[PDB]
Amino acid sequence: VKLFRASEPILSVLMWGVNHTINELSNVPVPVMLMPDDFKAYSKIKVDNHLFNKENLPSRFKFKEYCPMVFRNLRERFGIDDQDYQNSVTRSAPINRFLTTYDRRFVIKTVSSEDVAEMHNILKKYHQFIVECHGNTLLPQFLGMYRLTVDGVETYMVVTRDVFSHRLTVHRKYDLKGSTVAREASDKEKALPTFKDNDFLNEGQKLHVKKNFLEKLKRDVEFLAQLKIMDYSLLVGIHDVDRAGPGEFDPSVDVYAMKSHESSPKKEVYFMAIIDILTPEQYSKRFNEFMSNILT
Amino acid sequence: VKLFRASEPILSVLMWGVNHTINELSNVPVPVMLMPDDFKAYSKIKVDNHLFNKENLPSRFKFKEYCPMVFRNLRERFGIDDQDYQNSVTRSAPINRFLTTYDRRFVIKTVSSEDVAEMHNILKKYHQFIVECHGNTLLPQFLGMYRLTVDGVETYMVVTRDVFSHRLTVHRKYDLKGSTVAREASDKEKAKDLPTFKDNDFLNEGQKLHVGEESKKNFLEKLKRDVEFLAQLKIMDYSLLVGIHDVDRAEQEEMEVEERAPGEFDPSVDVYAMKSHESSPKKEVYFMAIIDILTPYVNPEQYSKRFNEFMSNILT
Numbered sequence A: 001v002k003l004f005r006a007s008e009p010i011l012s013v014l015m016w017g018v019n020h021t022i023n024e025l026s027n028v029p030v031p032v033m034l035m036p037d038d039f040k041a042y043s044k045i046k047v048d049n050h051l052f053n054k055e056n057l058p059s060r061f062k063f064k065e066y067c068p069m070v071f072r073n074l075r076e077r078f079g080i081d082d083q084d085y086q087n088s089v090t091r092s093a094p095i096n097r098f099l100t101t102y103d104r105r106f107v108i109k110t111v112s113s114e115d116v117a118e119m120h121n122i123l124k125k126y127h128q129f130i131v132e133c134h135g136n137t138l139l140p141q142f143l144g145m146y147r148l149t150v151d152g153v154e155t156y157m158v159v160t161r162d163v164f165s166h167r168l169t170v171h172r173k174y175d176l177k178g179s180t181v182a183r184e185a186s187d188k189e190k191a192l193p194t195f196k197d198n199d200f201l202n203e204g205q206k207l208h209v210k211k212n213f214l215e216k217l218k219r220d221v222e223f224l225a226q227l228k229i230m231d232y233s234l235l236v237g238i239h240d241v242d243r244a245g246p247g248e249f250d251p252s253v254d255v256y257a258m259k260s261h262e263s264s265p266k267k268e269v270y271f272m273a274i275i276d277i278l279t280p281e282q283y284s285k286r287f288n289e290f291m292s293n294i295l296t
Numbered sequence B: 001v002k003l004f005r006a007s008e009p010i011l012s013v014l015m016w017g018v019n020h021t022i023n024e025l026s027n028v029p030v031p032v033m034l035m036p037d038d039f040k041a042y043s044k045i046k047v048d049n050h051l052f053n054k055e056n057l058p059s060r061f062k063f064k065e066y067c068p069m070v071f072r073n074l075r076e077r078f079g080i081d082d083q084d085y086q087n088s089v090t091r092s093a094p095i096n097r098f099l100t101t102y103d104r105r106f107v108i109k110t111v112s113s114e115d116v117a118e119m120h121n122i123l124k125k126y127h128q129f130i131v132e133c134h135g136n137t138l139l140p141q142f143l144g145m146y147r148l149t150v151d152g153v154e155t156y157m158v159v160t161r162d163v164f165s166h167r168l169t170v171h172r173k174y175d176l177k178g179s180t181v182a183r184e185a186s187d188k189e190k191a192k193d194l195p196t197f198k199d200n201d202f203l204n205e206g207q208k209l210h211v212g213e214e215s216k217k218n219f220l221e222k223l224k225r226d227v228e229f230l231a232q233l234k235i236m237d238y239s240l241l242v243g244i245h246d247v248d249r250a251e252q253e254e255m256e257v258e259e260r261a262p263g264e265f266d267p268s269v270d271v272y273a274m275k276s277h278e279s280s281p282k283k284e285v286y287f288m289a290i291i292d293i294l295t296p297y298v299n300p301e302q303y304s305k306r307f308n309e310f311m312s313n314i315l316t
């Protein structure tokens, strides 16, 4: 019995909504392909209950899913079964505005309306790109995009596959941007930190192994730049096994994880992917040079 | 997998809505008992899709369910599973303003707004009646009540268990009220396939339902307390509906359709069904129940009395 009990009412509307739309979809046949209208489509539902079902949900809310057919197909191409998606959002409240499902499998980012319009500007070319690389990419994997309205105010969310493992605790994080400026991390933010370009540079961390990652990444960033996208960051995460199976993951679940070489001094397993692709040609080149210097 | 395909957008919406509300109800705990709020509660949902899922449902529709919890409770008390109710409304479209679920189990009537209000005025006492008789009534057994909005316009629908058997064909039917007034089936009506015969048609035909003692008392006591209850609510125009099933005729019809290549029933399911007396001429099976009870106010005391004195000797 999916009681939608959450940390705050918009989370329970989210759980209700993802549940509702995913069931709805279970009743819609998967087509032999997607169509232009599928990229201009949306689901909208409005709930006014009165003295009924109020114990955990609101009595008045709205839920809109953008291009449900396209995002369900994306879900299939990324290897996510729909009822696993549904279970991870609905079994227990998402946690911590940026959220993870209770099982650390997916992240739910609160997003500006400009970003929703950017998603619509790109989505056909993004889908064909997922098609052409058979999902082997490092761009964020978009699994749904929703708009919740509750108590009056609208909120936009983009669900995506987590860059990090849902199992192995990540021990250090770096948001590399390739800046010609010097994006360092704040003393305030230093006191698990988030290190940017200058600090992975003046830290001495290297990543050891092999090279087909460079093929995947360069394809991704040539694509993003060929679409006037900027401000994206490559996110890197180190898990030192030694802290205390260890360095044990399922490469079909953590599709971004990667094992160290015997070279590596510490016992490390890495996770890496591109993030924040919703908003310049020089950006791609500088970004790629800085990400080049990183391997051993 | 449910397409909700149907001949009319209205029916598709009815299937979608019964599905949605039963599924929503699935996640709501079953209370220890009902609070008064539940008797003035409702659940609305308004759908407006766009370029999505329009093969059968309209893009734009609304669906309201009344006192969903007391009708869930009623369903329980009437021995109907929520899953079953949902499936017989959604597995295939209902058929023929009146509707029947594909499996001939439940009936969906289009009613007025005032019928809805009248059901609301009486619902609290009706639920306590159904409670204090364990679901042993001739009264209609109300399973849900809804309000659909297709293409801008509202339709009110009341779901009820069928007085007729889902298996056993009905060969003759009567609608009786005990009116002093000459109530007879029109020459237009008297010439349908299964005509709906009124009182005079029952009398000029000398029809006698012969059920034998024990079932005759179940019936007479049920009818007595049912219509006393209806009277106390100042409710009128209710009819007793009786369908006659010809056992031998059905045996023959089945034989004639099996050539184209028992006489028993479940009172768990055909709740208004009664067998004919052992020493009876034709082996028949009857279905008898009161219907059309959502109309408030000679006096309704008088209507109770005349109705009862009539149906008292409809059978013997």
Ligand SMILES: O=c1[nH]cnc2c1ncn2[C@@H]1O[C@H](COP(=O)(O)OP(=O)(O)OP(=O)(O)O)[C@@H](O)[C@H]1O
Pocket: B039, B040, B041, B113, B114, B116, B117, B120, B121, B147
């Ligand atoms: O809870 C109730 N206790 C008693 N009586 C009720 C209750 N609930 C409804 N009634 C009556 O039930 C009829 C159907 O009317 P309705 O309300 O379902 O339709 P709305 O008025 O909302 O009009 P709308 O602006 O949405 O087009 C109207 O006599 C309405 O007073």
Ligand SMILES: O=c1[nH]cnc2c1ncn2[C@@H]1O[C@H](COP(=O)(O)OP(=O)(O)O)[C@@H](O)[C@H]1O
Pocket: A098, A107, A161, A162, A163, A164, A175, A194, A231, A232, A233, A235, A275, A276
């Ligand atoms: O997939 C993820 N798993 C865990 N944390 C993430 C993930 N994606 C982003 N984050 C966290 O949220 C931060 C903000 O990233 P993003 O670049 O998308 O926001 P921005 O638009 O302010 O630059 C990331 O640097 C990281 O701290």
Ligand SMILES: O=c1[nH]cnc2c1ncn2[C@@H]1O[C@H](COP(=O)(O)OP(=O)(O)O)[C@@H](O)[C@H]1O
Pocket: B098, B107, B161, B162, B163, B164, B175, B196, B239, B241, B291, B292, B293
């Ligand atoms: O449960 C049922 N099973 C089969 N027929 C029914 C059932 N309920 C109603 N009917 C048919 O519908 C007719 C009209 O019933 P009712 O008196 O409730 O509607 P009304 O508002 O037109 O008078 C009944 O006389 C009977 O012919």
